[PDB]
Write a protein that binds this ligand. Structure first.
Ligand SMILES: *[C@@H]1O[C@H](CO)[C@@H](O[C@@H]2O[C@H](CO)[C@@H](O[C@@H]3O[C@H](CO)[C@@H](O)[C@H](O)[C@@H]3O)[C@H](O)[C@H]2NC(C)=O)[C@H](O)[C@H]1NC(C)=O
Ligand SMILES: *[C@@H]1O[C@H](CO)[C@@H](O)[C@H](O)[C@H]1NC(C)=O
Ligand SMILES: *[C@@H]1O[C@H](CO)[C@@H](O)[C@H](O)[C@H]1NC(C)=O
Length: 309
C-alpha cells in the first residue's frame, strides 16, 4: 500500500479540530496514521507550554513523531514553536507536498519562524504548489539559503522571504554546508540523504557516488539515476555487469535454473498453464527446465514415463 495507506485527516480548525489553536497534547493522537491533511497545520508555543483554559497538558515532544506519516498538506504549514531538544523538523521528514490552497495572511503556505533548529530537515519536500515561503528569525538555522525553491514551486509569483537566520559565513565556518554528493540545487541538512537532488545517483533516499555495477553486493543496475537491486536469481558477474534491468528475465547469467527466459530458484512444479492442466517441469544436466511427460500429473525428475514411477 505504498507504505502507509492513504488516510485523509482534517486540518487544524476543521471537524474534530474545530476551535483549536494548535496541534497539541489532546489532539495529536487523532493524527495517528494520517497521510494527507485536508487543511492547515499550526504548531504554536502554547502546544509546548500547556493551556489550562482549554484543559490541555504540555505536548510531549516524542509524540510529534506521529506526524511522520504525513505526506501531503493541502493548506499551509505554520511552525512558530518546536521542542528545544530537536535540531530539525524530522517529524515532517516524509512530507512531500504543500499545496497552499489556503494561506497564512493570504500569502504564505510554509512559514517557519522563531525556532532554534539548526536545519529544516524536510528531506522529502518536492512541491509547494502555491503560496510564498517564509523562514525568518531562526537564529541557528543553516542550509536554508542553498535551496533553489524554484524546483519546488509550481505557480508564477511564488517567492521566499529567508531572513534573520544564521549568517551564511557563520554556517560555512562551522561546516554546515551541503554534502559533496548533493547537486547544486541545495539541501535540507548536511547529510547525503538531505539533498534536493543527487550529484550522481541515488539509492533509496540516499545520494551516493555510484551503483554497484561491477563490484559490491547486491549488484544493481541504474534506472533513471537510481540504483536498483538486481534480481537474486541473477548470478553476479566477476567481469561483466549482472543485470540489464528488473526481474529474473534481465540477468546476464542465471544463478540456479533456467526456465526459458526466466532465471528461477527451482523449476516450476505445479504452476498454472494455458489449458485445464498444471505445468510440471524438471532440470536437465545444464540446469535447463523442460516440460515433463503429460502423464506425470504430480511431477517428474527425468523425461518420459520413467520420470514418474
Ligand atoms: C487542543 O486541542 C483540543 C482538541 O483538538 C482543543 O479542544 C477543543 O477546544 C474547543 C474550545 O477551545 C472546544 O470547542 C467547543 O466545544 C463545545 C462543546 O462541544 C461547543 O459547544 C463550542 O461551540 C466549541 O466548539 C472543543 O470541544 C475541544 N475539544 C476537545 C476534544 O477538547 C483545545 O482547545 C486545543 N487547545 C489549544 C491551546 O490549542
Ligand atoms: C499505522 O496504524 C497501524 C494500525 O492502524 C499500526 O499497526 C502501524 O504501526 C501504524 N504505523 C506506524 C508507523 O506506527
Ligand atoms: C559524479 O558526478 C560528478 C559531477 O559530474 C563527477 O565529477 C563524478 O566523476 C561522478 N562520479 C560518478 C561515479 O559518476
Amino acid at each position: 500500500c505504498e507504505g502507509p495507506c492513504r488516510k485523509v485527516c482534517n486540518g487544524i480548525g476543521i471537524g474534530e479540530f474545530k476551535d483549536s489553536l494548535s496541534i497539541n497534547a489532546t489532539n495529536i493522537k487523532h493524527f495517528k496514521n494520517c497521510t494527507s491533511i485536508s487543511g492547515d497545520l499550526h504548531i504554536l508555543p502554547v502546544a509546548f507550554r500547556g493551556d489550562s483554559f482549554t484543559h490541555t497538558p504540555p505536548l510531549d515532544p516524542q509524540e510529534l513523531d506521529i506526524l511522520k506519516t504525513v505526506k501531503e498538506i493541502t493548506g499551509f504549514l505554520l511552525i512558530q514553536a518546536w521542542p528545544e531538544n530537536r535540531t530539525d523538523l524530522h517529524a515532517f521528514e516524509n512530507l512531500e507536498i504543500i499545496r497552499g490552497r489556503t494561506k497564512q495572511h493570504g500569502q504564505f503556505s510554509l512559514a517557519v519562524v522563531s525556532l532554534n533548529i539548526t536545519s529544516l530537515g524536510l528531506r522529502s519536500l518536492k512541491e509547494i504548489s502555491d503560496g510564498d515561503v517564509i523562514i525568518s528569525g531562526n537564529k541557528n538555522l543553516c542550509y536554508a539559503n542553498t535551496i533553489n525553491w524554484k524546483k519546488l514551486f509550481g505557480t508564477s509569483g511564488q517567492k521566499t522571504k529567508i531572513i534573520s537566520n544564521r549568517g551564511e559565513n557563520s554556517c560555512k565556518a562551522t561546516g554546515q554546508v551541503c554534502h559533496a554528493l548533493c547537486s547544486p540545487e541545495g539541501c535540507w541538512g548536511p547529510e547525503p540523504r538531505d539533498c534536493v537532488s543527487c550529484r550522481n545517483v541515488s539509492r533509496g533516499r540516499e545520494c551516493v557516488d555510484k551503483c554497484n555495477l561491477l563490484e559490491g553486493e547486491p549488484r544493481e543496475f541504474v534506472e533513471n539515476s537510481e540504483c536498483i537491486q538486481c534480481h537474486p536469481e541473477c548470478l553476479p558477474q566477476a567481469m561483466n555487469i549482472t543485470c540489464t534491468g528488473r526481474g529474473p528475465d534481465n540477468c546476464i547469467q542465471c544463478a540456479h535454473y533456467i526456465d526459458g527466459p526466466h532465471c528461477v530458484k527451482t523449476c516450476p512444479a505445479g504452476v498454472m498453464g494455458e489449458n485445464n492442466t498444471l505445468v510440471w517441469k524438471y532440470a536437465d544436466a545444464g540446469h535447463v527446465c523442460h516440460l515433463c511427460h503429460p502423464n506425470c500429473t504430480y511431477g517428474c525428475t527425468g523425461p518420459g514415463l520413467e520420470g514418474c514411477p
